[PDB]
Amino acid sequence: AVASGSGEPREEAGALGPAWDESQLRSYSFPTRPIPRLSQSDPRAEELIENEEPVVLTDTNLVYPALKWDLEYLQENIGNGDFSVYSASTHKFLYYDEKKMANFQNFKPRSNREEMKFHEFVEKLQDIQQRGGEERLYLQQTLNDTVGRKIVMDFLGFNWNWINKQQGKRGWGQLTSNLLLIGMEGNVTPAHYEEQQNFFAQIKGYKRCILFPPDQFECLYPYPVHHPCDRQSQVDFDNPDYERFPNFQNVVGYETVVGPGDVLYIPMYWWHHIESLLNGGITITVNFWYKGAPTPKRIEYPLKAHQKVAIMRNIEKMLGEALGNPQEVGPLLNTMIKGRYN
Amino acid sequence: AVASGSGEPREEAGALGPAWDESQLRSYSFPTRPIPRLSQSDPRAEELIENEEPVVLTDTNLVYPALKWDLEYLQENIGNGDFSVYSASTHKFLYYDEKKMANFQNFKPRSNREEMKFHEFVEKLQDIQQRGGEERLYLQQTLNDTVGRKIVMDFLGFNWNWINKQQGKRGWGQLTSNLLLIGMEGNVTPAHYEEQQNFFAQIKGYKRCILFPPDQFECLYPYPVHHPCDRQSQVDFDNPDYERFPNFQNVVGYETVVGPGDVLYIPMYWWHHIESLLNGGITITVNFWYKGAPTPKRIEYPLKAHQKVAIMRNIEKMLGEALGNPQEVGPLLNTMIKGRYN
């Protein structure tokens, strides 16, 4: 009733049937309520972004020229740069930071990155489907100046007017990157948060986005900051370990399904889990990552959740540096608390 | 055998019998080994201080002129300043910081401070013994310029030559204070550590000093830094709570009994428990508190125990400040660790 989740699937224009159905959504242990789906012109929408709460905007025209993109058009135009393509034999593409792996010798990534040309990505993808294989690929590459000219012309056709006014109104920093994500149906990016703001622009296919506010930190159990999986949840949403992660029993999400033309504001520090709909075919998304506003030169109380998260990260970072080794951070913290604060 | 504790009591000169006996010592749950008792001229002694390990020095003449002090001589000469005198109905004089009590409304000190003149202290003391009362007093007052002239002349007669060379050789900072401690037999100062160096000069009576190295932090469970009892152990040595304080089962001490003329080096950050011998009469001690050496402008690994303690204190202090309230420090630390580092 109020945990209505994604709502009843919207009907595509010209009576082309429901855009997707409930059977295409994985099933999880926690409840969810809908993210509001609004017009760009709607004051409530503006109110939501202003308060750093998520909103799906349905008519921004942010990536209007990308709406025609598909593998053929992109193979033809995207140029000959290298693309990072992740490979796995599980649906879950857990993000990991390769620069942090030296310190965590026992971290064994379930997904592998292969650099390859776009045409190779399409071939590899084609091979899989034809031999009916089980491996999965997820291409995740920042857009850069090696892309061909039509892609340049597409990008330039994005609604910069609208998004630059957002960046200005919110006091955000610079646009840092636009990630192009191309995924196979049923792919999942497990829950994590970002230390930038994100307008997440869906282009092809459908993605279910499950978000949790920064105040659910205690229910989602991020990896240690020096771990490769910093910012990512330790919890396996498909098999939650309630003994290690008791407060995942209290977690409550905000969810939506985005399709072509939709843009989801994912506010900085908000947890998000992203899945490409089962049997939905391939998905394409391009994101827009902005540095957040500078923090006030002085802090007002009561502190917000995301400011406590920032504090916790800085304590872990400083401890890692002062102790000279990140693996001592935990023993020190435990000594700090046991019998004194727990 | 090697947990010989304080050793066999030394025999006073001129066959005046053992200075004290084992029945005068409270009994505790942990074992102890002896602190070395050495001559000032002994290279080992110098080696111990250099390494910041405790040593009882038997012949420094640090407070030679104070050796004649007793209540009469001091009532007569100590002047008319106010003396802080603590009062309690238990043997344990737990130190607390009055400036921190505002933040811990529920802290109820078992001992009370009364300012009073020395003659009043001696009267109050006299009254107690005569009416055979159970209350206890402990006078603890820094020596300052209000003291009378003979006390000034006594102080000036201290062995500054010897102790100034110590301060120099070790690279210590300034002498900050000389606390005069006058206690009733059976008084205990429960275990704590100091963030200064200490030469502890015994003048009258006997004190058993039990020390623990900085690396026993995990066994001794200091109060939170913003608590009034910062630097003091939470553990009741007379009734240890092994459920709250499991690692107090692993604690191992270094002990000695100091009498007139002895000086105990209590190195900075070393825990110490101090008791005036049962049925020993009153005790007098004067301490000498020096700021420690500046820390290296750069840190060498592996870090020492006392440097981890300094780190832990600075993390608690910074958290208290950033969160705007010391009582949030624990909830934040717990959120930091649960399911992530424990």
Partner: peptide
């Protein structure tokens, strides 16, 4: 400065 933050995202810097 304990509330300061950097800009890490699920993509290489």
């Amino acid at each position: 400065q304990l509330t300061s933050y950097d800009a890490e995202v699920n993509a290489p810097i």
